[PDB]
């Protein structure tokens, strides 16, 4: 669960940027660590004091992030036939 506030820098998004603080653990299984991060409104959803929201997949499906080493480029790839065809 999340503790989020509306951002305050400009008006072009004014909203949509939620300064979400939260508890978490860390390396030392015995340790904790609640930090804050800024998220776009499309990656989260609220749940029904200040409003609290988690994530829309957290009742449907698991979540992975991309390992940052790979690219995302569509590559020009020729598609060849097995011979005899």
């Amino acid at each position, epitope marked *: 669960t999340l*503790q989020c*506030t509306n951002v*305050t820098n400009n008006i072009t998004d004014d909203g949509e940027l939620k300064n979400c*603080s939260f508890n978490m653990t860390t390396e030392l299984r015995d340790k*904790k660590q*609640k930090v*804050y991060s800024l998220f776009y409104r499309l990656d989260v959803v609220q749940i029904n*004091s*200040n409003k609290e929201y988690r994530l829309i997949n957290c009742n449907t499906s698991a979540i992975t992030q991309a390992c940052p080493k790979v690219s995302f480029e569509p590559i020009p790839i020729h598609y060849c036939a097995p011979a005899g065809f």
Partner: antibody
Amino acid sequence: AEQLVESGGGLVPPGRSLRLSCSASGFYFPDYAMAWVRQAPGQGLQWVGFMRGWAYGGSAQFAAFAVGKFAISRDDGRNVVYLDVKNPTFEDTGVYFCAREQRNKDYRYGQEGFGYSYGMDVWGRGTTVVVST
Amino acid sequence: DIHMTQSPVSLSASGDRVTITCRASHFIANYVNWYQQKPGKAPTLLIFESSTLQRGVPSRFSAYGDGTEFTLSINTLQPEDFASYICQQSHSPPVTFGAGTRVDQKR
């Protein structure tokens, strides 16, 4: 630098509700939770209520007399805390201190316990409100 | 409520050694912030958490305790130390303060 400016009125007629203003400066203000301590003149300190930081919920509790009689509201867009004294009484004549909360040497509050243990480092000037006509 | 009865009520000394004992009604093991308000002025934390020196407060002060009955001591007195010294708990809401000690000079 890191200073707190209390204002909001002097002579107020009783019943006519009151707005205060704990104007801050000098630091990143939603790092710290906020509280109100009043003091009747010639008396000891009389804590009114606190309000947590938003990462701690932004939750605001009070003292026993301050249940219903008062209402805290902070504004990080201005770095100011408004205190609402609805139906002021002549009992509520006193100097009104406002202070912040102090993080540790690791810049944190307490994990277990109440959470707030490192006191109120910067004290404001205090505003003086007399509830009389 | 957990009440602080701070002892003494007033104090008189002259470079003397001052000792102030503030007790409780419950077990507050180390959760007391020791304050200083000079008259007509703001408060000033002296010993946070009943034993540890606040940065900016000189080393002539010393607080400690037991769990219920805490004790501040001063070695030694300075002529600007004649102020009101207040114990205050940090164990439980609501915030309760101490009696204070308006200190004058023994004469």
